[PDB]
Amino acid sequence: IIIATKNGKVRGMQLTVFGGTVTAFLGIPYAQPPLGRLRFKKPQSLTKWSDIWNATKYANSCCQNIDQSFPGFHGSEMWNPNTDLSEDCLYLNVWIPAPKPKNATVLIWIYGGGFQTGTSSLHVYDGKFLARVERVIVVSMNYRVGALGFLALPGNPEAPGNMGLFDQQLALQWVQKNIAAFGGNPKSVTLFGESAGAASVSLHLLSPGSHSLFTRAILQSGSFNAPWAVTSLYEARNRTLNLAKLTGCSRENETEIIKCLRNKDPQEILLNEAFVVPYGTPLSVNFGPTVDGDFLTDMPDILLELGQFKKTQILVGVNKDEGTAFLVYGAPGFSKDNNSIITRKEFQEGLKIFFPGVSEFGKESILFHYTDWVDDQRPENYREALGDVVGDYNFICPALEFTKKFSEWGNNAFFYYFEHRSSKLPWPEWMGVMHGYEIEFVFGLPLERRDQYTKAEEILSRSIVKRWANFAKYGNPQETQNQSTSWPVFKSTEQKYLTLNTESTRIMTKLRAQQCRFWTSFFPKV
Numbered sequence: 298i299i300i301a302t303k304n305g306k307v308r309g310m311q312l313t314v315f316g317g318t319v320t321a322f323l324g325i326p327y328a329q330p331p332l333g334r335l336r337f338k339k340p341q342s343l344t345k346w347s348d349i350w351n352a353t354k355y356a357n358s359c360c361q362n363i364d365q366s367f368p369g370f371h372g373s374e375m376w377n378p379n380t381d382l383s384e385d386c387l388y389l390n391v392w393i394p395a396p397k398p399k400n401a402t403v404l405i406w407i408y409g410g411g412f413q414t415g416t417s418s419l420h421v422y423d424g425k426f427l428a429r430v431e432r433v434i435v436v437s438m439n440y441r442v443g444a445l446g447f448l449a450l451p452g453n454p455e456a457p458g459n460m461g462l463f464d465q466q467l468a469l470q471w472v473q474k475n476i477a478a479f480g481g482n483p484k485s486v487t488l489f490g491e492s493a494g495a496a497s498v499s500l501h502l503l504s505p506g507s508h509s510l511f512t513r514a515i516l517q518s519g520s521f522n523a524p525w526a527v528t529s530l531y532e533a534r535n536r537t538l539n540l541a542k543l544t545g546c547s548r549e550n551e552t553e554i555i556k557c558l559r560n561k562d563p564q565e566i567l568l569n570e571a572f573v574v575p576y577g578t579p580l581s582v583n584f585g586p587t588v589d590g591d592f593l594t595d596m597p598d599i600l601l602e603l604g605q606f607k608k609t610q611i612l613v614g615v616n617k618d619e620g621t622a623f624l625v626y627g628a629p630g631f632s633k634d635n636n637s638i639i640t641r642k643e644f645q646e647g648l649k650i651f652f653p654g655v656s657e658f659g660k661e662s663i664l665f666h667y668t669d670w671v672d673d674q675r676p677e678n679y680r681e682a683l684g685d686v687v688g689d690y691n692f693i694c695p696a697l698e699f700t701k702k703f704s705e706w707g708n709n710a711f712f713y714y715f716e717h718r719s720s721k722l723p724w725p726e727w728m729g730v731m732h733g734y735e736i737e738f739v740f741g742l743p744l745e746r747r748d749q750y751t752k753a754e755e756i757l758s759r760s761i762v763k764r765w766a767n768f769a770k771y772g773n774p775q776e777t778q779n780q781s782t783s784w785p786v787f788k789s790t791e792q793k794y795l796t797l798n799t800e801s802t803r804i805m806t807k808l809r810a811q812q813c814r815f816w817t818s819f820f821p822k823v
């Protein structure tokens with residue numbers, strides 16, 4: 298129950314899972330608290346301690362704005378932080394099988410949340426099930442979000458940008474130096490993440506300082522070429538300056554802006570983040586990754602196109618209705634509490650909410666490519682088109698594009714399409730297979746019989762869990778024992794992908810082919 302690390306001893310705690318035992322180490326620090334002079338700077342390495350750190354409960358989540366649109370609604374609040382917010386939040390968690398494994402493959406989770414929110418503490422990121430069932434070691438970390446994590450005055454080490462990514466990297470570094478003490482193999486480390494976590498995983502494939510800190514990668518509903526993933530260095534500074542004026546810290550010694558922003562309280566920074574953007578959307582990434590010349594040496598589009606990334610296997614996928622969840626956070630005529638049958642004029646208004654700085658012609662082009670109905674009568678037409686618009690543009694087509702381009706340099710890639718609508722979900726049915734609702738299947742929660750889950754859902758989760766583990770351990774996400782559909786390699790030409798559902802696993806080709814030719818070739822030019 299006590300492990301000696303390079304910076305001191307840590308005491309864990311024991312969990313009973315499925316008649317077995319998992320050892321959990323919740324809240325190990327991996328950096329100096331980024332307080333005081335350290336706010337906005339890269340994470341600094343931890344100086345030794347001499348006691349026994351008690352890693353027996355989740356640590357503080359990092360400071361962040363909370364979604365307040367559906368108070369008391371679990372569909373919404375399952376995503377909000379479940380620990381104290383604090384700037385003192387650079388901690389990670391380790392779940393190891395009991396008894397201690399000998400050379401276990403390691404999975405490192407990176408949460409999403411638009412780079413503005415999120416925490417490793419969430420119920421759906423609980424790694425105890427993967428530890429128990431597949432005898433892998435699961436690690437997850439908190440990393441700074443919002444402006445405290447990604448404020449950028451480029452070149453300036455007081456606010457260089459990408460701090461949250463450097464938090465993640467330092468945690469990967471911690472696993473390299475320390476996980477062998479826990480029974481893990483530092484040579485078999487698979488990163489996985491969802492949404493902005495998935496976009497983070499992809500940027501680690503680009504970043505030269507992460508090359509040697511992991512083996513393989515899994516990207517769930519996200520990647521760095523998504524339109525929200527990378528902030529330009531011009532608008533990044535425009536946003537840093539708008540934050541400065543909004544807080545009274547406008548100086549012209551740029552370093553004096555930072556010192557001034559450092560004497561503010563977290564809440565004062567958090568409440569002005571929303572207004573640095575001229576027009577925002579429910580997908581807005583106010584403060585996110587930038588080309589800082591340190592973590593990220595060039596525009597990631599160019600690195601992807603010219604083959605400049607870690608050469609390894611990737612596992613990539615998306616959900617059937619990525620876009621629906623965002624419609625109820627602003628689109629007119631939409632509500633989780635009715636069937637959201639919108640009219641043509643409502644759809645048009647929705648495009649302005651989701652594509653605010655886009656030309657009238659650009660929005661006509663979206664409407665023209667998504668409103669040629671097979672049947673003109675059905676009243677769902679517009680409601681469904683706007684969901685597909687937001688999901689294809691923001692998630693599915695970037696994920697596909699990334700996989701094509703990545704596979705063209707010779708590495709095995711596997712693509713999935715998650716289309717299971719969970720039996721007992723609190724969101725209405727019209728929202729479908731929503732963004733983030735594969736995560737619980739990946740983490741094995743449906744394996745807990747004890748629950749809301751059907752038997753079909755238990756079997757689906759058990760299969761996904763085996764596929765993810767085989768991918769981590771062996772680079773190949775097959776389930777070999779139960780006469781399962783083989784998962785073909787995804788290649789630039791044939792573009793095969795595997796569907797994930799409770800009924801029929803199927804091999805299909807060329808997901809969203811018509812829609813993504815629009816988003817990937819026509820729409821970037823408007």
Ligand SMILES: *[C@@H]1O[C@H](CO[C@@H]2O[C@@H](C)[C@@H](O)[C@@H](O)[C@@H]2O)[C@@H](O[C@@H]2O[C@H](CO)[C@@H](O)[C@H](O)[C@H]2NC(C)=O)[C@H](O)[C@H]1NC(C)=O
Pocket residue numbers: 532535536538539540542543572573574575
């Ligand atoms: C860059 O920033 C300027 C200024 O941002 C404004 O002030 C901030 C404190 C904050 O409150 C923002 O929401 C404000 O917009 C932007 O210029 C403004 O543009 C909007 C309309 O596009 C409008 O508020 C004003 O006409 C402008 N204000 C000023 C002082 O010029 C600008 O659009 C931002 N983007 C770019 C690309 O430069």
Ligand SMILES: *[C@@H]1O[C@H](CO[C@@H]2O[C@@H](C)[C@@H](O)[C@@H](O)[C@@H]2O)[C@@H](O[C@@H]2O[C@H](CO)[C@@H](O)[C@H](O)[C@H]2NC(C)=O)[C@H](O)[C@H]1NC(C)=O
Pocket residue numbers: 628629630631632634635636637638
């Ligand atoms: C679906 O619901 C929305 C609004 O939700 C509820 O109704 C409101 C009257 C209010 O009590 C909210 O707190 C509820 O959550 C409907 O959108 C509204 O439609 C009418 C149009 O005359 C009007 O009240 C508002 O302009 C609309 N609100 C918006 C656009 O945000 C919508 O009509 C409902 N759809 C169906 C099919 O019933």
Ligand SMILES: N[C@@H](Cc1c[nH]c2ccccc12)C(=O)NCCCCCCNc1c2c(nc3cc(Cl)ccc13)CCCC2
Pocket residue numbers: 364372373376409410411412413414415491492578579580581582583622626724731732733734
């Ligand atoms: N400025 C953005 C920043 C942001 C916050 N969370 C985001 C998630 C994706 C993209 C961006 C964001 C913003 O605050 N938008 C307000 C609405 C975003 C949804 C809140 C976050 N919670 C969810 C999250 C996920 N799925 C959700 C699905 C549903 Cl149905 C409802 C909420 C989900 C999956 C990843 C983590 C957050």
Ligand SMILES: *[C@@H]1O[C@H](CO[C@@H]2O[C@@H](C)[C@@H](O)[C@@H](O)[C@@H]2O)[C@@H](O)[C@H](O)[C@H]1NC(C)=O
Pocket residue numbers: 308349350351353
């Ligand atoms: C660290 O933990 C030591 C042992 O605590 C044990 O585990 C917790 C979960 C409780 O069940 C406790 O009763 C157990 O004895 C403590 O003795 C020690 O004081 C702790 N150290 C600090 C700094 O808190």
Ligand SMILES: *[C@@H]1O[C@H](CO)[C@@H](O)[C@H](O)[C@H]1NC(C)=O
Pocket residue numbers: 399400482484485
């Ligand atoms: C763990 O596996 C690696 C190769 O993957 C090997 O080099 C290392 O010595 C192993 N360590 C053990 C078995 O303790």
Ligand SMILES: *[C@@H]1O[C@H](CO)[C@@H](O)[C@H](O)[C@H]1NC(C)=O
Pocket residue numbers: 550552553
């Ligand atoms: C003010 O700016 C100069 C550069 O012009 C910089 O060297 C100096 O450190 C700044 N002042 C303080 C107090 O840091």
Ligand SMILES: *[C@@H]1O[C@H](CO)[C@@H](O)[C@H](O)[C@H]1NC(C)=O
Pocket residue numbers: 759760763776778779
């Ligand atoms: C394979 O099938 C058995 C039942 O025949 C089931 O109990 C087991 O969990 C399945 N394994 C996987 C990895 O799906």
Ligand SMILES: [Cl-]
Pocket residue numbers: 379419420
């Ligand atoms: Cl909880």
